[PDB]
Amino acid sequence: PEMVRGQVFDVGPRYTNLSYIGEGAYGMVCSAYDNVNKVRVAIKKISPFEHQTYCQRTLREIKILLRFRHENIIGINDIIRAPTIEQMKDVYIVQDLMETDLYKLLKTQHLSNDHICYFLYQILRGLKYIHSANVLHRDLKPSNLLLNTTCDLKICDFGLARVADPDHDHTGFLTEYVATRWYRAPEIMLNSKGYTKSIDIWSVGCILAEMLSNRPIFPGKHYLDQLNHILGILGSPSQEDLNCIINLKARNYLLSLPHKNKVPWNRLFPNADSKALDLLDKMLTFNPHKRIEVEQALAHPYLEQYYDPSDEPIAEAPFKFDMELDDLPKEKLKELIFEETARFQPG
Numbered sequence: 001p002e003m004v005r006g007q008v009f010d011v012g013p014r015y016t017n018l019s020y021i022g023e024g025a026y027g028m029v030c031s032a033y034d035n036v037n038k039v040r041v042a043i044k045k046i047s048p049f050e051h052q053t054y055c056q057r058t059l060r061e062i063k064i065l066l067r068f069r070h071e072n073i074i075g076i077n078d079i080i081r082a083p084t085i086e087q088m089k090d091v092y093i094v095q096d097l098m099e100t101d102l103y104k105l106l107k108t109q110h111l112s113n114d115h116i117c118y119f120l121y122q123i124l125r126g127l128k129y130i131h132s133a134n135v136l137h138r139d140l141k142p143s144n145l146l147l148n149t150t151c152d153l154k155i156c157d158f159g160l161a162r163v164a165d166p167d168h169d170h171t172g173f174l175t176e177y178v179a180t181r182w183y184r185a186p187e188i189m190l191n192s193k194g195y196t197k198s199i200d201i202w203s204v205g206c207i208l209a210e211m212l213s214n215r216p217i218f219p220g221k222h223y224l225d226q227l228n229h230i231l232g233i234l235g236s237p238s239q240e241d242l243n244c245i246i247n248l249k250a251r252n253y254l255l256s257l258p259h260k261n262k263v264p265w266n267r268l269f270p271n272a273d274s275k276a277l278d279l280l281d282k283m284l285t286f287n288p289h290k291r292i293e294v295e296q297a298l299a300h301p302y303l304e305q306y307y308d309p310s311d312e313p314i315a316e317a318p319f320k321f322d323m324e325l326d327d328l329p330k331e332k333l334k335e336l337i338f339e340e341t342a343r344f345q346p347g
């Protein structure tokens with residue numbers, strides 16, 4: 001059994017010639033040569049059975065990506081694990097191998113307007129399919145956007161993905177959230193659980209703004225600082241947008257702040273295309289109900305060179321979890337992970 005950087009990586013005999021890529025919070029990704037299809041692939045070793053959270057993230061992703069099939073979404077083409085639940089200590093998920101990601105690119109490369117336009121198109125084409133399945137990604141950021149040498153984009157990491165639930169989206173002021181801070185919609189800190197499609201559009205808006213300047217538009221250093229960064233550019237919410245926030249603690253917090261004017265997009269981004277900034281404005285709308293939807297975003301004049309709704313596929317049916325995974329112990333989640341991966345075993 002071959003191992004990478006002092007960690008067991010038993011994926012043989014089908015996958016050999018391992019090379020390190022990255023290491024997550026509860027796993028490791030390596031590139032490996034597939035002896036059946038004779039092509040290099042990415043294998044993600046997962047060790048989640050000691051924590052309920054990691055088991056929940058593993059299962060959600062496996063169930064969603066096995067039912068999804070789209071050019072701009074990472075796939076699960078094979079799953080390797082032990083033949084019994086007793087012997088299963090790890091799970092190896094075989095996915096698409098991509099040379100780089102948008103986080104890596106933005107650190108050192110200046111993106112031409114053509115590149116920004118093409119990247120945004122593929123993100124939204126991928127998101128159209130995700131949202132048509134009534135699924136929310138909930139953690140869109142440059143590191144979860146993989147790219148190959150020809151700039152083909154794939155959305156990855158569905159660990160925080162959920163079925164859309166707009167009727168149960170309301171919550172109190174300063175409710176704790178898991179998803180990456182810099183890409184959190186303003187309503188998360190005010191009165192939202194992130195159970196609507198509009199939280200993903202906000203994250204895409206932040207990604208677009210980041211592609212234009214090679215720096216995160218709202219780099220909050222802590223929970224409430226995130227909202228203050230958003231209000232610093234958007235300005236004070238209108239009376240209309242304030243009236244939509246019925247929660248008194250959230251509304252009175254916004255009312256306590258001095259009046260702040262809107263920073264114009266052309267001042268923040270002097271070299272950006274005017275159509276790119278008009279679409280940015282619509283994605284970074286304070287009110288989630290007035291925020292542009294994925295299909296509307298794809299039809300925006302900025303993406304006219306690529307827009308073709310007949311070549312922007314949707315899922316065949318809406319997604320539905322058989323049971324709620326929020327209140328299941330790590331032991332039961334192990335069984336569910338064992339069951340969902342059974343179809344990939346040699347027998």
Ligand SMILES: CCOC(=O)CNCc1ccc(-c2cn[nH]c2-c2c[nH]c(C(=O)N[C@H](CO)c3ccc(F)c(Cl)c3)c2)cc1Cl
Pocket residue numbers: 021022023024025026027028029042043044046074095096097098099100101143144146156157159
């Ligand atoms: C700071 C630690 O960094 C990360 O977690 C991600 N960046 C490194 C990286 C960069 C590229 C790739 C890569 C290259 N080709 N295919 C993939 C890939 C294949 N699957 C995934 C994936 O599911 N990634 C998510 C995070 O985006 C993830 C989720 C949970 C995890 F335990 C790990 Cl290790 C990774 C990525 C893999 C990796 Cl791990």
